DNA sequence: CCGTCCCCCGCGTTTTAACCGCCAAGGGGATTACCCCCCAGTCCCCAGGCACGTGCCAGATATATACATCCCGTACGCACGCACATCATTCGAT
């Protein structure tokens, strides 16, 4: 029951509205605990952020690459 | 670098059990006496061990060959997301 990775990621940030930006783990724990994702879930989430930040709609407030915190950037 | 928690930290109770001060007993550590029996001292000595030679052996030493193993590639599954058409929703016309 997993649609395209665009949707839960933005939903997860909406769940915990950190103004400083959500740290990489905060999304990772919730979406796997809440929904059901494939055996290689964590790998897909990391590059999901990586491609998502390249699209520019999300802002990494702290850290470099995937290791930091990210923000919806409205 | 980032983050993440929890698990030590100060701090406030409050219990107590160390710490004190005193009293007592006697075991035993410290001290003396007696001595015998025990190890050092000699002489003689004689065979155990050491210095020297010696070879034989096997211990080695070298050969060739089989086998065990590792890494990479290969293939192949698979579950996957992306992409896609289709199904279903939505704006306009009705």
Curated annotation (Swiss-Prot):
Residues bearing the modification Citrulline: 19
Taxonomic superkingdom: Eukaryota
Induction text: Both the unedited and the RNA edited versions are induced by butyrate (at protein level). Only RNA edited version is induced by DTT, vinblastine or TNF (at protein level).
Residue span, H15 domain: 1-74
Compartments, as annotated in UniProt: Nucleus; Chromosome
Family: Belongs to the histone H1/H5 family.
General function of this protein: Histones H1 are necessary for the condensation of nucleosome chains into higher-order structures. The histones H1.0 are found in cells that are in terminal stages of differentiation or that have low rates of cell division.
Name by which UniProt lists this protein: Histone H1.0
Originating organism: Homo sapiens
Lineage of producing organism: Eukaryota, Metazoa, Chordata, Craniata, Vertebrata
Gene giving rise to this polypeptide: H1-0
Shown part of the complete sequence: 24 to 97 of 194
């Amino acid at each position: 029951d997993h649609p395209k990775y665009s949707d839960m990621i933005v939903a997860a940030i909406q769940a915990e509205k950190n103004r400083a930006g959500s740290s990489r783990q905060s999304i990772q724990k919730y979406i796997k605990s809440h929904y059901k994702v494939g055996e290689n879930a964590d790998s897909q989430i990391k590059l999901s952020i990586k491609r998502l930040v390249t699209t520019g709609v999300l802002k990494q407030t702290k850290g470099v690459g995937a290791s930091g915190s990210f923000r919806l950037a409205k």
